[PDB]
Design a protein around this nucleic acid. Sequence first.
RNA 1: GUGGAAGUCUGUUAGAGUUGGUGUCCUACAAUACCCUCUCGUGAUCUAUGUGUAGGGGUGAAAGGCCCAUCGAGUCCGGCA
RNA 2: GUCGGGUGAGAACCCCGACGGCCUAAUGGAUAAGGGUUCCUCAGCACUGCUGAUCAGCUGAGGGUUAGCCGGUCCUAAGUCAUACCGCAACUCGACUAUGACGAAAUGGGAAACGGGUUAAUAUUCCCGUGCCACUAUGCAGUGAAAGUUGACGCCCUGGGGUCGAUCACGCUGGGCAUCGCCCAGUCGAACCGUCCAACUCCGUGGAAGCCGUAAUGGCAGGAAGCGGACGAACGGCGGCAUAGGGAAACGUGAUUCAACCUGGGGCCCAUGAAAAGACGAGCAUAGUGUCCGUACCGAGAACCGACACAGGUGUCCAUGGCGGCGAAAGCCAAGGCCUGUCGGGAGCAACCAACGUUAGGGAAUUCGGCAAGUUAGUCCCGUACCUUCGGAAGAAGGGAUGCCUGCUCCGGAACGGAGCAGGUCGCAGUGACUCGGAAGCUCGGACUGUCUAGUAACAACAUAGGUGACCGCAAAUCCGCAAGGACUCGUACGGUCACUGAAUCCUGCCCAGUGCAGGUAUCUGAACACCUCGUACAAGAGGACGAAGGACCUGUCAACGGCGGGGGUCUUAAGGUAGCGUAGUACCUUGCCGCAUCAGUAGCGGCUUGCAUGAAUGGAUUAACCAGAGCUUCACUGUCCCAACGUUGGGCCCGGUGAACUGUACAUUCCAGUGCGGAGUCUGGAGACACCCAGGGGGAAGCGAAGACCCUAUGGAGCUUUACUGCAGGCUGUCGCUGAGGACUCUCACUCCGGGAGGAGGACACCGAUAGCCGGGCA
RNA 3: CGAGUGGCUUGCUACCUCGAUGUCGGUUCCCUCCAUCCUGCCCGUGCAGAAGCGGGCAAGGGUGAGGUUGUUCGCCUAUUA
RNA 4: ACGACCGUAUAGUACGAGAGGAACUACGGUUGGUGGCCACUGGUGUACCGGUUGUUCGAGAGAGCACGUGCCGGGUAGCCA
Lengths: 56, 237, 73
Amino acid sequence: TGAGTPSQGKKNTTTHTKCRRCGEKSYHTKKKVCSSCGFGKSAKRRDYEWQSKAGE
Amino acid sequence: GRRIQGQRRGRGTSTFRAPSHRYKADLEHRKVEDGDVIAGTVVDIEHDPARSAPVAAVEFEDGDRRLILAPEGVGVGDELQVGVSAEIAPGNTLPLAEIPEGVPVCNVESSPGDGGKFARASGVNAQLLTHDRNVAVVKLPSGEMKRLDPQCRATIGVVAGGGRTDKPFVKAGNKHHKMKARGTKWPNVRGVAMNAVDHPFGGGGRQHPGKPKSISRNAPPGRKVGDIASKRTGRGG
Amino acid sequence: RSGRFGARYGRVSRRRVAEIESEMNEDHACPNCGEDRVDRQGTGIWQCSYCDYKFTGGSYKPETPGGKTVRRS
RNA sequence: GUGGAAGUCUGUUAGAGUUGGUGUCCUACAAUACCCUCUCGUGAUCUAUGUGUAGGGGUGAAAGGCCCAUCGAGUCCGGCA
RNA sequence: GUCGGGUGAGAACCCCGACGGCCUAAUGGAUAAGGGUUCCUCAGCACUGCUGAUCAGCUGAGGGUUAGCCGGUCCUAAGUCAUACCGCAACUCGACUAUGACGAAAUGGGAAACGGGUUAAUAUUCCCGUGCCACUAUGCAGUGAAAGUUGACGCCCUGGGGUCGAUCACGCUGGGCAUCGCCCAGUCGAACCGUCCAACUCCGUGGAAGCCGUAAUGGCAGGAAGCGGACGAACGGCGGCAUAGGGAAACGUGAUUCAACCUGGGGCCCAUGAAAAGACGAGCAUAGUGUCCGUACCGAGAACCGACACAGGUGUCCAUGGCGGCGAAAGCCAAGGCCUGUCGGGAGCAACCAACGUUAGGGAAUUCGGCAAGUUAGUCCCGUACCUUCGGAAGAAGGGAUGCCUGCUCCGGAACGGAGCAGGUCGCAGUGACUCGGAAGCUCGGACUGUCUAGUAACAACAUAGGUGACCGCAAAUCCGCAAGGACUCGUACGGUCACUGAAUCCUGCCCAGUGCAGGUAUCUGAACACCUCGUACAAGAGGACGAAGGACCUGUCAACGGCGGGGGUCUUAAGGUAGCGUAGUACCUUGCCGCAUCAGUAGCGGCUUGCAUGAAUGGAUUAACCAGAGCUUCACUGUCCCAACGUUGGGCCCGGUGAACUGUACAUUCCAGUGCGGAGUCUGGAGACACCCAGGGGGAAGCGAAGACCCUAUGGAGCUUUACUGCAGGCUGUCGCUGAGGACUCUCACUCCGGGAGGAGGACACCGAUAGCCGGGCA
RNA sequence: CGAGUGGCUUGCUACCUCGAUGUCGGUUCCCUCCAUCCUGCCCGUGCAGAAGCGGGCAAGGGUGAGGUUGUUCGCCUAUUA
RNA sequence: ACGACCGUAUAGUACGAGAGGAACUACGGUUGGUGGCCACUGGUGUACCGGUUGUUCGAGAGAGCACGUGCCGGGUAGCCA
Ligand SMILES: [Cl-]
Ligand SMILES: [Cl-]
Ligand SMILES: [Cl-]
Ligand SMILES: [K+]
Ligand SMILES: [Mg+2]
Ligand SMILES: [Mg+2]
Ligand SMILES: [Mg+2]
Ligand SMILES: [Mg+2]
Ligand SMILES: [Mg+2]
Ligand SMILES: [Mg+2]
Ligand SMILES: [Mg+2]
Ligand SMILES: [Mg+2]
Ligand SMILES: [Mg+2]
Ligand SMILES: [Mg+2]
Ligand SMILES: [Mg+2]
Ligand SMILES: [Mg+2]
Ligand SMILES: [Mg+2]
Ligand SMILES: [Mg+2]
Ligand SMILES: [Mg+2]
Ligand SMILES: [Mg+2]
Ligand SMILES: [Mg+2]
Ligand SMILES: [Mg+2]
Ligand SMILES: [Mg+2]
Ligand SMILES: [Mg+2]
Ligand SMILES: [Mg+2]
Ligand SMILES: [Mg+2]
Ligand SMILES: [Mg+2]
Ligand SMILES: [Mg+2]
Ligand SMILES: [Mg+2]
Ligand SMILES: [Mg+2]
Ligand SMILES: [Mg+2]
Ligand SMILES: [Mg+2]
Ligand SMILES: [Mg+2]
Ligand SMILES: [Mg+2]
Ligand SMILES: [Mg+2]
Ligand SMILES: [Mg+2]
Ligand SMILES: [Mg+2]
Ligand SMILES: [Mg+2]
Ligand code: NA
Ligand code: NA
Ligand code: NA
Ligand code: NA
Ligand code: NA
Ligand code: NA
Ligand code: NA
Ligand code: NA
Ligand code: NA
Ligand code: NA
Ligand code: NA
Ligand code: NA
Ligand code: NA
Ligand code: NA
Ligand code: NA
Ligand code: NA
Ligand code: NA
Ligand SMILES: [Sr+2]
Ligand SMILES: [Sr+2]
Ligand SMILES: [Sr+2]
Ligand SMILES: [Sr+2]
Ligand SMILES: [Sr+2]
Ligand SMILES: [Sr+2]
Ligand SMILES: [Sr+2]
Ligand SMILES: [Sr+2]
Ligand SMILES: [Sr+2]
Ligand SMILES: [Sr+2]
Ligand SMILES: [Sr+2]
Ligand SMILES: [Sr+2]
Ligand SMILES: [Sr+2]
Ligand SMILES: [Sr+2]
Ligand SMILES: [Sr+2]
Ligand SMILES: [Sr+2]
Ligand SMILES: [Sr+2]
Ligand SMILES: [Sr+2]
Ligand SMILES: [Sr+2]
Ligand SMILES: [Sr+2]
Ligand SMILES: [Sr+2]
Ligand SMILES: [Sr+2]
Ligand SMILES: [Sr+2]
Ligand SMILES: [Sr+2]
Ligand SMILES: [Sr+2]
Ligand SMILES: [Sr+2]
Ligand SMILES: [Sr+2]
Ligand SMILES: [Sr+2]
Ligand SMILES: [Sr+2]
Ligand SMILES: [Sr+2]
Ligand SMILES: [Sr+2]
Ligand SMILES: [Sr+2]
Ligand SMILES: [Sr+2]
Ligand SMILES: [Sr+2]
Ligand SMILES: [Sr+2]
Ligand SMILES: [Sr+2]
Ligand SMILES: [Sr+2]
Ligand SMILES: [Sr+2]
Ligand SMILES: [Sr+2]
Ligand SMILES: [Sr+2]
Ligand SMILES: [Sr+2]
Ligand SMILES: [Sr+2]
Ligand SMILES: [Sr+2]
Ligand SMILES: [Sr+2]
Ligand SMILES: [Sr+2]
Ligand SMILES: [Sr+2]
């Protein structure tokens, strides 16, 4: 069984969903954590300096 | 390289955990104020998943239903006693001090009141040898002479299920089923059969530990494999 | 006996299984009454079909050598 | 004679797999497909869903295998022009 | 698919009928996930659709999903999160312990709904009929009320009860067929209420010393059979429900085999097969309340994932439709679905290719190799070797039979079950198609089933049971974490950790010098602190004394790393290869030599064997069984071959429509020679050469596709190794702090551990902080 | 001992090619060379004959099937002008 | 577009003590190669005719399906060796 096309047919699990806090489809319904804004993980909003060029 | 199997164990992930949610109970002796005024009736005999040996369900006078580490010879209906004044008979528990020298005992406590630590496995038994006002001497299953507080509680008789080890598993499948009831990763891939990156013995054209197996006690985890601090090896001499 | 093992495993392994189980399945004298109606119920668990006495014993024998020692001493 | 054990046999039952054809395909139906043959099929079996283990770390009946077409150290962005 | 026809400006593919076909665990019915309006209607064809299109999953516009009793909602599972506590420089980080919450929509547990009717689209939701559950109120009854029971459970074999379905017999209703007299369909009717009870258990009676009983096991004076009784089942029987419903009509009755469902008996475990909410226990009348969320449709060779309307992938139930047969097998056929695994038209339709049928004689000569193809085949009877772990080998091998028809016998209660007999009789052929093993021997390997490189490796590799060695008495050994803490562990030596070998059988020699591990150790060596001398009004610093682990030194140990030679009739460096096996999957020499077998055998097998360079758990030998494992031989068979032929289906070719990509410095009709950076269509000399087009098989363009994988180079990279360099964790050990009282000692008060507690054990140690010496590819 | 020809073997060189000119053996299909194995015609002989042995002209045609081995080569078998 | 061989007569002759043993020439045939043809033999022949298994159309008759003939037997034209 190839890792490619044939293995793609087994994918019918819902993980990432519309996030209550930020509105992005990043709320992982299994972990109950938003990979985009951090909801469910932290009160503070998920943010990182590497999201932009260092001097900008 | 990569951490060896022995190091993966320590993390306690599911693969290495025992099926505790399927275990019955921890056959620890009952706690009595004093007097020995405690007796119960063997209500049933059950299989203990964690030890592959039988356990006896007992109902005590004061209304407490608990499983007990049963010796060989205990059956339904029988009456058991637990306390200083307990009768000297198989299945009864009392402090070593009350036990007569030369009597086979099991589920011996290490420290008075801990519930029992020694000789709990199938068909084994400790042998109470010397008595005293300060120290009770017991010969444990390994043949070691152990010095215990005469206050350490114990059960008369040998543990039920003796001889379990006399029959060969015969097939992998049987080993399999037993291993599924323990905190153990099985089957076992030999270190010499792995890649160098995975074990000190891995690598090489033909399989062989390109090094002596007797490893020092001071060796760090990841390197402490093979024959740990062996005082000797082989069968010779 | 080990006939269910066919030509597999080899002598020893299946010779002991036959002997162990041969003795295991024999009629055993019940400690309670005196009849030879004791059958194994599971690992180390024995019962008499006559008086219904359910008790603990060896894994494959109702009584073990070490077990018959506690009596003495 | 009865009985009906078995990591037991036959078996395209379901289901799982893949020895050979070095067949077909090779801007494919398909970034691993098609056909015939072949193997397993009461058990260390197969399978659904849920759940756990996370990057020098997992997981590995050990092939440096597998961890979302990527693994002798994943992916993303940043360090970075 | 074809012939007619319908609609339309337009019809091969939109619709109707007929004829012809395809699908049967699916190409049919219901659904989970996922999708998200794809569902229904009307109007459309610019877009999307492998051609066309009046069609549509497409475009425009409207419409559609109705619940006390179907899910959710409730419970708890593996397990998750939150708060508290503690750690951390810190946190959105981290382990334990408390508390709380979260965690199952087909497929865990669970109060209660059936039948029919209705719409373009919903429907146990609406409507009709009937019924049921929970709570609450009122009334009657009730003092019970919590013990127990249930929820609630593994694997294998099996009896009994029993519905649907299917089938048989006969009757009734309707249809079909028309030499017969047959063939098909229907013959209905729920939940619910009431009632019946087999099995199990038990009681009374009885009184078996050999009887009772089973498919089997089994039962009994501790009381068998028999007789009576208590308790007690179905999604089942029976009555109501039902001058409900449904049907054009009839609107049946018995039987056999019996899925569901109910209830028992047996066997297995070094394996023991959830929990909780809830329910019962615990009556009845009447009335009220029962909110909130889901509900369409697809569920796949076009509604999901795979960029696609993708031959892939994707769970559940329909597992009892007919013939067939052992069968949930093949083949054929219903119910139901479809002609959308969606471009057509034409040419006896050439070459060539993919799949396939048939081939005289020879029969593996083909080939690395019988690769490919074929041979055999189902069932019954006879019969069956070597060898063997006594199981097996084995369906060994080899031999014979096999249909139909007429009349019967036996087993069984019987089957539309099975086993035989006699006579008759047809074919080339009776497992007539389909289904359906080719067989035998020798050798190597691994014992076996099992595992593996998703995507070139299925093997001899990994695993395995078995054998062995090592560590550890649990305040342990081993392992994870910076810490708080944690796995092993509801575990305790018959344990579980770390390794090696790899079933059974017969065995497993010699070596402790080096290296590793471990133990010991007079003496030697061995750091820091404190101490002492010198030095400094102090300090830096120099030296001394004491000396832990460690090393020197000694001993133990090879199923510990490994080793078992050269020379002479000992030497290096400890020993100097024993049993076995041997030209090996190890033997260079080598096609060794002898033999077997063949016309001929670098092969294979047996023997010899000085073994370039076999050898005992780096396991040796051997081995029945097993194997999509490597090699060899034989019988059988055959288009593999001699040597090719004819045929079949789909392409190819021509026509309508649709309609890409690769590749392209330029020029280019070349050929023979030469030359040139020595491998030129293009330079030189000749030769040949009128342009264009179709089909072909691929000689050349050092053809296209990839900044060669091989090799080297770079004061490139990475993974891996070690007695490379340098460091870092970690372990051991001394010392200082915690730390107290009276080179050996006692105590208790810190601190640690056991204990529910009292109290017990230990104790200035241990843990922890700091530092010093040793080890330290575990890591950088 | 001396003198040459070839470019089938081997060695040497590093001239071409590392932004790839795919390897050995075999197979199939075509053209060629002669230093001729057979066939045609000749000369010599230690040529009676038959047959050998050596030599000359000559490339029209032919040069096959099999056993081991991947093998090339070769060893071997029966045929053959 | 033809190459080569065997055999017979020559002849048991020439030659030679014998053993052995030719040729010119005239014939018949085989083999390899080549071109063509199908009266003959052979193959094919999913034209066709027949036999027959399972199933469906109620039986009969006559048919479909079982892969592009279910299977088996025979085989015209044509094509072929
Ligand atoms: Cl074990
Ligand atoms: Cl639902
Ligand atoms: Cl029964
Ligand atoms: K090159
Ligand atoms: Mg316990
Ligand atoms: Mg497990
Ligand atoms: Mg192993
Ligand atoms: Mg490996
Ligand atoms: Mg390593
Ligand atoms: Mg899963
Ligand atoms: Mg509907
Ligand atoms: Mg399609
Ligand atoms: Mg033939
Ligand atoms: Mg050949
Ligand atoms: Mg084959
Ligand atoms: Mg009868
Ligand atoms: Mg060999
Ligand atoms: Mg194997
Ligand atoms: Mg692969
Ligand atoms: Mg395989
Ligand atoms: Mg082992
Ligand atoms: Mg063992
Ligand atoms: Mg072991
Ligand atoms: Mg091994
Ligand atoms: Mg192995
Ligand atoms: Mg040989
Ligand atoms: Mg040895
Ligand atoms: Mg080894
Ligand atoms: Mg090329
Ligand atoms: Mg390059
Ligand atoms: Mg390289
Ligand atoms: Mg490097
Ligand atoms: Mg504690
Ligand atoms: Mg390194
Ligand atoms: Mg060069
Ligand atoms: Mg010449
Ligand atoms: Mg002559
Ligand atoms: Mg020529
Ligand atoms: Na028997
Ligand atoms: Na295959
Ligand atoms: Na990494
Ligand atoms: Na009823
Ligand atoms: Na049937
Ligand atoms: Na179409
Ligand atoms: Na198997
Ligand atoms: Na040594
Ligand atoms: Na050796
Ligand atoms: Na196998
Ligand atoms: Na053929
Ligand atoms: Na070409
Ligand atoms: Na690397
Ligand atoms: Na030359
Ligand atoms: Na070649
Ligand atoms: Na010639
Ligand atoms: Na040869
Ligand atoms: Sr696939
Ligand atoms: Sr899935
Ligand atoms: Sr969180
Ligand atoms: Sr931030
Ligand atoms: Sr405990
Ligand atoms: Sr405890
Ligand atoms: Sr190694
Ligand atoms: Sr020894
Ligand atoms: Sr099996
Ligand atoms: Sr099978
Ligand atoms: Sr292959
Ligand atoms: Sr084939
Ligand atoms: Sr491919
Ligand atoms: Sr079966
Ligand atoms: Sr991948
Ligand atoms: Sr960058
Ligand atoms: Sr379906
Ligand atoms: Sr138009
Ligand atoms: Sr539609
Ligand atoms: Sr919940
Ligand atoms: Sr449910
Ligand atoms: Sr099951
Ligand atoms: Sr029955
Ligand atoms: Sr629906
Ligand atoms: Sr599909
Ligand atoms: Sr139909
Ligand atoms: Sr179309
Ligand atoms: Sr024919
Ligand atoms: Sr052959
Ligand atoms: Sr051959
Ligand atoms: Sr036969
Ligand atoms: Sr696999
Ligand atoms: Sr494969
Ligand atoms: Sr062995
Ligand atoms: Sr040593
Ligand atoms: Sr020897
Ligand atoms: Sr062996
Ligand atoms: Sr072409
Ligand atoms: Sr190039
Ligand atoms: Sr010449
Ligand atoms: Sr000649
Ligand atoms: Sr050779
Ligand atoms: Sr003649
Ligand atoms: Sr003569
Ligand atoms: Sr047909
Ligand atoms: Sr046949």
